[PDB]
Amino acid sequence: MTVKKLYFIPAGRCMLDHSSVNSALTPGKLLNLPVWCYLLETEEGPILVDTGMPESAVNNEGLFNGTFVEGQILPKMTEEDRIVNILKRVGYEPDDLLYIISSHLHFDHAGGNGAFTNTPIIVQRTEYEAALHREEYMKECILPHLNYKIIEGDYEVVPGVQLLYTPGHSPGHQSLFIETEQSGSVLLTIDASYTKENFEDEVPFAGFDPELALSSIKRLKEVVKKEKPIIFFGHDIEQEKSCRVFPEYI
Ligand SMILES: CCCCCC(=O)N[C@@H](CCO)C(=O)O
Ligand SMILES: [Zn+2]
Numbered sequence: 496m497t498v499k500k501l502y503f504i505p506a507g508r509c510m511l512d513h514s515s516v517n518s519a520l521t522p523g524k525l526l527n528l529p530v531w532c533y534l535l536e537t538e539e540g541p542i543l544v545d546t547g548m549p550e551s552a553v554n555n556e557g558l559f560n561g562t563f564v565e566g567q568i569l570p571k572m573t574e575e576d577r578i579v580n581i582l583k584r585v586g587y588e589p590d591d592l593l594y595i596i597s598s599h600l601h602f603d604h605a606g607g608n609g610a611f612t613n614t615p616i617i618v619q620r621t622e623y624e625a626a627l628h629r630e631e632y633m634k635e636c637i638l639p640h641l642n643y644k645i646i647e648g649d650y651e652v653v654p655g656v657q658l659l660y661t662p663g664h665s666p667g668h669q670s671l672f673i674e675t676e677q678s679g680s681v682l683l684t685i686d687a688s689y690t691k692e693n694f695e696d697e698v699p700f701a702g703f704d705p706e707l708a709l710s711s712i713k714r715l716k717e718v719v720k721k722e723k724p725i726i727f728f729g730h731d732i733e734q735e736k737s738c739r740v741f742p743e744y745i
């Protein structure tokens with residue numbers, strides 16, 4: 496069985512130093528990177544992958560002033576980029592969603608999680624437990640009373656929607672392998688590779704455990720050899736130019 500439609504939905508942007516996309520680069524040039532969420536229309540109902548940035552980021556590029564990442568990360572988020580507003584424009588309210596899938600709990604991927612207080616939020620155990628104590632996690636991304644559906648390892652959410660455990664960039668990062676009616680096999684690496692060169696050329700990039708990130712890239716490459724999917728990376732300015740985005744779908 497296949498997903499009916501896979502939508503790429505812009506959810507604001509984020510400035511990062513270029514050394515975060517290629518660890519060999521000299522710090523000092525910021526890159527204005529895309530932030531994405533994905534909407535899957537399935538037989539069982541709509542599924543949202545990631546939830547954008549927290550409300551604290553709205554019109555607040557200096558959000559991380561005074562923290563260990565001051566000047567390194569600057570969110571570019573307007574009121575329109577709040578996930579609830581994105582969803583309402585698309586045609587949904589939070590309680591309409593079948594599942595939320597959190598690729599991981601970094602601030603640009605889980606900042607909107609608090610909006611979903613009934614929908615099960617599928618997240619890896621190792622990610623959830625990291626978010627409880629590691630300093631790179633915002634409180635907005637680990638709210639205590641949401642309906643978490645904690646999983647361990649690879650997982651089938653519904654037919655056509657597979658989660659691949661790809662730790663390294665974060666302790667419980669997961670990627671998506673989706674089968675769509677229009678396109679067949681699609682791999683969303685999410686932050687298992689920010690850019691094409693992180694994936695193809697194994698160019699190192701920001702992560703909790705680069706050695707583990709590399710092993711997850713090698714694992715994805717084995718999947719790619721078998722399945723020959725179309726592949727989309729987490730924060731790739733070049734690829735963004737050619738991506739079909741909402742209202743188009745793949
Ligand atoms: C563990 C190394 C990654 C740092 C934390 C972070 O939130 N990174 C953002 C960078 C801005 O997009 C992300 O996940 O995308
Ligand atoms: Zn991340």
Ligand SMILES: [Zn+2]
Pocket residue numbers: 601603604686729730
């Ligand atoms: Zn990211």
